[PDB]
Amino acid sequence: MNGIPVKLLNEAQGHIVSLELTTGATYRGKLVESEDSMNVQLRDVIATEPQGAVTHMDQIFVRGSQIKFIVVPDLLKNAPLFKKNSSRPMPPI
Amino acid sequence: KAMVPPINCIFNFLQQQTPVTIWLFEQIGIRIKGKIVGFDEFMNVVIDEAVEIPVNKGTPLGKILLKGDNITLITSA
Amino acid sequence: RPKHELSRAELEELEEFEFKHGPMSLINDAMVTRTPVIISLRNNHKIIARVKAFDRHCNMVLENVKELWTEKKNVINRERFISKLFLRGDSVIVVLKTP
Amino acid sequence: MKLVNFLKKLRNEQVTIELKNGTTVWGTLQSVSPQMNAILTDVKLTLPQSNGIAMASLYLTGGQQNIASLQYINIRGNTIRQIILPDSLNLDSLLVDQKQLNSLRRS
Amino acid sequence: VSTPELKKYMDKKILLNINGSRKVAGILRGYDIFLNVVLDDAMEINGNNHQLGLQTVIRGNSIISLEALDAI
Amino acid sequence: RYYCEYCHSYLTHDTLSVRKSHLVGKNHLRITADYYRNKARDIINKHNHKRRHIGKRGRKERENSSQNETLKVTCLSNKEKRHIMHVKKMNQKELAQTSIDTLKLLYDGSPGYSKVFVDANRFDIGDLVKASKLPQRANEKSAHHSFKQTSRSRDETCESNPFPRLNNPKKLEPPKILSQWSNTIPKTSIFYSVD
Amino acid sequence: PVNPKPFLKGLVNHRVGVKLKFNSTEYRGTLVSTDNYFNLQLNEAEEFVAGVSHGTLGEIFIRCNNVLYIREL
Amino acid sequence: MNYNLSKYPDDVSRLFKPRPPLSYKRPTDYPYAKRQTNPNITGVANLLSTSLKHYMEEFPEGSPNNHLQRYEDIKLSKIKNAQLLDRRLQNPNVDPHIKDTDPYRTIFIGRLPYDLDEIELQKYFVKFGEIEKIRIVKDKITQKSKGYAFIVFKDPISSKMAFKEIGVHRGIQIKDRICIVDIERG
Amino acid sequence: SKIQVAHSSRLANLIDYKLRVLTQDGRVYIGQLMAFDKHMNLVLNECIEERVPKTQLDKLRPLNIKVEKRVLGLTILRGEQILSTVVEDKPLLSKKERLVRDKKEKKQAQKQTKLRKEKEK
Amino acid sequence: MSTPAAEQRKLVEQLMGLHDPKICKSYLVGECPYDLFQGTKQSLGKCPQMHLTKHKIQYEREVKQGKTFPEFEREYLAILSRFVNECNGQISVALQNLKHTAEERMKIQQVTEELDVLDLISKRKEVAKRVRNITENVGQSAQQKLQVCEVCGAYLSRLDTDRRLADHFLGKIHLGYVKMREDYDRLMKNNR
RNA sequence: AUACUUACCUUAAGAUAUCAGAGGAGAGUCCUACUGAUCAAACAUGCGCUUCCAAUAGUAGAAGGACGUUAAGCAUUUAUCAUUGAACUAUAAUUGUUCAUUGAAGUCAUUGAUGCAAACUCCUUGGUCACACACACAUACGGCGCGGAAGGCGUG
RNA sequence: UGGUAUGUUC
């Protein structure tokens, strides 16, 4: 259905992440609320245009197809989404 | 006021029959001016009385079924 | 008619009916009469070849490919003969059939 | 009627692949996804006569020492422009389309 | 499938960027599940000024991001 | 369907309004915070030692090393090393949690104390403080604390508190010293200090 | 009032013109058939590079990937 | 970096001190204003004039398609089988075995046993009305019992009641099988 | 680089390998994969992104090449703007040690299910 | 749907005289009660009449300048009156259930046993016994401590703070029912 | 932990490798602890197979780096436009030269950026293993030790 | 035929 990477992107909500866009502009800020379509909203945004300059947005909202990548913090190195043999405690009928 | 979804925005834009400036792709693309008569779910917009002007001597074009994947921006001139 | 509400497992029959009596009349005529067609691609690679198979994505198998492109510096034409080819429908600009 | 199932019958076939960037990849096929994500081994790839982005993509894959010899490359579907099959393979027996034959028998 | 969370941008001035430079500053009147953006009183900003009619609708394919120019 | 890997709780068909409300509730917060704390504690506490490589040492190194001296090994009992390592763990966590807060209490009567140090009238991150108040939908969380808020507004000017010594200040804290090395302090002061 | 599908089913058997995205390929011919993915099939088409012609083509299949619009003369 | 909106406590936030910001350098690709494929692609009319005459001269004949020929042979065999089935099905008044009385009193019992006899079938059919005639149908190529019979009774109401009593209780238990009875459907 | 990548392996078998994934730009990401999906969205542990400058490209055109390396750490890269992925370096622990670790994870998961069944009673 | 293109096709197919029974008059005027209770626990199922956006836009364009139709307004008034009568019956049933819970048999027996022992010094003893009976009544009422919502007829609480109450008022049921009460009061002010 | 209120929601389907033949069920479909063949997975197992596994008879060195130093190393290149005033080269929205009033944004970086080149130091990895400090080879090298890491082929 | 979250009393 959804998959592991979109669940990991929805996992790190409310944390300082860093995006890079397809044009080359790198954003960095606190993730407000991520979605399954990766259309992600950031706050306290610092932006670097592909020309080179640095600016600051207050509340950005980027579409998921114009994202090169996004960096989650390192404590999500150890996540239960990464566990291969985690069993399921009795799903409901 | 309220919320106006883009499909109802284009539908009211169709009912009012305002003069239309439709933009397209970048420097190869050419800005078109006309009047909307039909559209669909993939945003294939049908326009009439089309005059094309390049990016900064317009030529008439007639009636055009402009496809969706090149449409960028729609304004009321 | 909406695509999701037609039927189940009978969409292949409608796809074959669109293949026989739709825009696919030229790819069908080339694979049954073995006539050579000229496919112009999105990077000036013009292909003269015969069609072997049809796909929904216009993925086409071509046999006895004679392809030609033009390098513009000055102006030279470089060609290549390739025996078997599997062409993706992403690259295809246009398909012309000769009578 | 997807012809990716035709490429699924092409295991251990020594082919070339021209990509949309312009790189020619000579290697044997191992497997291919139904989304045409094809894996190849015993690979040498070459950017012919330019595109500096393609030269960067050619060199920055490890194993350059402009023919680059690599052991294992997975290739995404949308980067595949065309794939050239060896002429010794018979296309009349690999394109039998047994799924299409079962669909015609089910009609 | 999922409706995007543009509820906080209901009556605030936003600034769309189009493809590397076309900064359309408007007031968000509505959106869809395709990020098509309806803007009232649009304004093209160049690094000069250009007005873009009373209402406009902008295709979500060329939309990359949007700056919330007004406080929330 | 949706399954929380943290809380080990299932859900109905995947609604964004339900999944958004699941990551706000207090049980998911407790389980998630405890899981992150325990995984960080495990990756700190895991002493991944190097695999040892012992070679056949040289002859003259053996005649030099076995004749210089023989050192003494110190070692402790089980409860002693357990108590010492527990004190070292609480010292490491209290050093990881602490921070120097001298500039906040040292510029307390400054005329721009209500514009930078108040942390609510701050410009760049003050909207983040004013946004999530944790609005205390429980009545007991609002009825528990009965002390003053002492919220310093931005509009406080220099006319208020003109003389900082008449309004009773606090004497500054002394420089804290290590308790394990507290026996080497000079016991005699330079000047006579009363009270 | 109108939709692109009845306008495009009624556009069959007319000297129509199709511009591509590249501003150097315009094909003007008689439309034959069109599917729901809006692939185009033309007959006795003519190539138009930046306005000037090069020669007649004939029966041709224009892919909906590279079209920009279709016009009615 | 100092004060957060985050719902997590400060002990979690000290563990969530993020990475340092990324060291920006100059990009390598063209910007998205310049990202496009190649312009001025010439027409294909030059290949049909000069290159087609050299292409047809090197390969005047094409390769045969064995898979398309096998699919066409399978379609032709299916069409011939359908035509033979239509000729065998299209070609009750020209049958000497169906030259009995009217079908109002003539019921048909199908899926009967292959080793049954006419005496037991007559004794089973004469229980709910007087039977006038009985005829078990067999194949013309072989003398095997196909399991079908036609029983014409003296009255239509008694034959209908016998057919209802034989087809209502999950088929009549004829001695090795369950043979249901119904109308002749002539 | 004498690694001898497996001859019949796929993305489920290439997990926890130090990949060297190529993109459309050529911005090569080096790091361990830990997850994927249908769109080939790859998370990358201890990842580094390397490029070549425009001045170095003239020397690269037909030796030493000074690549520009930035450190990303744990990132999550999309499958749209990527081109190809290879296996650069083998992981730390071996196949038998990963097998023993997977058996310990299975036994720990079965013990956790027994603890949930004991707490449910 | 799993793809958004089929959702947009559905929006086009449902977006593209006028006095016909197929058009939902409560939706043609606005705020149909079968629309304001679609997916909640108080759902009525599915509206048998069809809803359309083009007819709603035509009705808005007619009511802007052209004219107004009193028949659809009277039908919406009758539907709102029937739904308000059903909700008032539900609120009266909830008030009767609250009165039955406040007047249970064992609770009234305990209250009568406390009041039978409730009878200067005698006045102070009677005041202390009345305070003890009031404390027992407060402990009996605090076992549930459920009030009655004056508008929507739900259950509330007095010791609950204003934030959980504000979370209660922002629901689909309460917003829809306050809008229906505003429409009913507007139609009763216009009719009378 | 029990009891109750409230806010949101209440589900895209079909299937689990392929081919040929025989039998059963009222041209088409299903089943066979039915039979032969291909393929996949798991567990074992062997191929004088393919690659790698760091001195100790010393104070070293192989692979990958430093987001380390010398190093502000050496050689190059840039660090805003317009109106007017006192002269002015002058096809420009006076561009060029010296000085200034004013007008819109106005990356920090010039100890900056690119290229070139050497030395030093420090990090992660290993069989730092068992015998010996030894005279072999045109069919070029007795690959005929105990293993480990990666892979190929073959068998059950 | 149910799930998630929250607030009171024992």
From Swiss-Prot, chain D:
Keyword Cytoplasm among record annotations: yes
GO biological process: 7-methylguanosine cap hypermethylation; mRNA 5'-splice site recognition; mRNA splicing, via spliceosome; spliceosomal complex assembly; spliceosomal snRNP assembly; U2-type prespliceosome assembly
Subcellular location: Nucleus; Cytoplasm
Function of the protein: lays a role in pre-mRNA splicing as a core component of the spliceosomal U1, U2, U4 and U5 small nuclear ribonucleoproteins (snRNPs), the building blocks of the spliceosome. Also binds telomerase RNA and is required for its accumulation.
Miscellaneous comment: Present with 2400 molecules/cell in log phase SD medium.
Comment text on domains: C-terminal extension may function as a nuclear localization signal (NLS).
The protein's name in its UniProt record: Small nuclear ribonucleoprotein Sm D1
Name of the coding gene: SMD1
UniProtKB/Swiss-Prot annotation, chain E:
Pfam family, one: LSM
GO biological process: 7-methylguanosine cap hypermethylation; mRNA 5'-splice site recognition; mRNA splicing, via spliceosome; spliceosomal complex assembly; spliceosomal snRNP assembly; U2-type prespliceosome assembly
Domain Sm residues, every copy: 1-72
Subcellular location: Nucleus; Cytoplasm
Key word Endoplasmic reticulum present: no
Single annotated GO MF: RNA binding
InterPro entries: Lsm7/SmG-like, LSM_dom_sf, Sm, Sm_dom_euk/arc, Sm_G
PROSITE patterns referenced in this protein's UniProt entry, alphabetically: SM (PS52002)
Cellular component GO terms held in the UniProt record: catalytic step 2 spliceosome; commitment complex; cytoplasm; nucleus; precatalytic spliceosome; SMN-Sm protein complex; spliceosomal complex; spliceosomal tri-snRNP complex
CDD domains (UniProt xref): Sm_G
Disulfide bonds: none
Keywords in alphabetical order: Cytoplasm, mRNA processing, mRNA splicing, Nucleus, Ribonucleoprotein, RNA-binding, Spliceosome
Chief location category: nucleus
SUPFAM superfamilies hit by this protein: Sm-like ribonucleoproteins
Miscellaneous note of the record: Present with 1400 molecules/cell in log phase SD medium.
Subunit structure: Component of the Sm core complex, present in spliceosomal snRNP U1, U2, U4/U6 and U5. The core complex contains SMB1, SMD1, SMD2, SMD3, SME1, SMX3 and SMX2 (Sm proteins B, D1, D2, D3, E, F and G, respectively), and is probably a heptameric ring structure. SMX2 specifically interacts with SME1.
Function: Plays a role in pre-mRNA splicing as a core component of the spliceosomal U1, U2, U4 and U5 small nuclear ribonucleoproteins (snRNPs), the building blocks of the spliceosome.
Record family assignment: Belongs to the snRNP Sm proteins family.
Protein name: Small nuclear ribonucleoprotein G
Swiss-Prot record, chain G:
Similarity section: Belongs to the snRNP Sm proteins family. SmF/LSm6 subfamily.
Compartments where located: Nucleus; Cytoplasm
Residues of the full protein shown: 12 to 84 of 86
Protein name (Swiss-Prot/TrEMBL): Small nuclear ribonucleoprotein F
Function: Plays a role in pre-mRNA splicing as a core component of the spliceosomal U1, U2, U4 and U5 small nuclear ribonucleoproteins (snRNPs), the building blocks of the spliceosome.
Record text on subunit structure and interactions: Component of the Sm core complex, present in spliceosomal snRNP U1, U2, U4/U6 and U5. The core complex contains SMB1, SMD1, SMD2, SMD3, SME1, SMX3 and SMX2 (Sm proteins B, D1, D2, D3, E, F and G, respectively), and is probably a heptameric ring structure. SMX3 specifically interacts with SME1.
Remaining remarks: Present with 2570 molecules/cell in log phase SD medium.
Keywords associated with the record: Cytoplasm, mRNA processing, mRNA splicing, Nucleus, Ribonucleoprotein, RNA-binding, Spliceosome
Superkingdom of origin organism: Eukaryota
Protein's UniProt keywords contain Cytoplasm: yes
Keyword check for Ribonucleoprotein: yes
A GO MF term: poly(U) RNA binding
Domain spans labelled Sm: 3-73
Gene of this entry: SMX3
Lineage of origin: Eukaryota, Fungi, Dikarya, Ascomycota, Saccharomycotina
Assigned GO CC terms: catalytic step 2 spliceosome; commitment complex; cytoplasm; nucleus; pICln-Sm protein complex; Prp19 complex; spliceosomal complex; U1 snRNP
GO biological process: one example: mRNA 5'-splice site recognition
From Swiss-Prot, chain J:
GO MF term set: mRNA binding
Keyword annotations from UniProtKB, A to Z: Acetylation, Coiled coil, mRNA processing, mRNA splicing, Nucleus, Ribonucleoprotein, Spliceosome
Subcellular location: Nucleus
GO biological process: mRNA 5'-splice site recognition; mRNA splice site recognition; mRNA splicing, via spliceosome
InterPro entries to which the protein is assigned, alphabetical: Luc7-rel (IPR004882)
GO cellular component assignments: commitment complex; cytosol; nucleus; spliceosomal complex; U1 snRNP; U2-type prespliceosome
Assembly and interaction partners: Component of the 18S U1 snRNP particle, a subcomplex of the spliceosome.
Note: Present with 2270 molecules/cell in log phase SD medium.
PANTHER family reported for this sequence: RNA-BINDING PROTEIN LUC7-RELATED
Similarity comment: family membership: Belongs to the Luc7 family.
Role: Component of the U1 snRNP particle, which recognizes and binds the 5'-splice site of pre-mRNA. Together with other non-snRNP factors, U1 snRNP forms the spliceosomal commitment complex, that targets pre-mRNA to the splicing pathway.
Protein name from the UniProt record: Protein LUC7
Species of provenance: Saccharomyces cerevisiae (strain ATCC 204508 / S288c)
Record gene name: LUC7
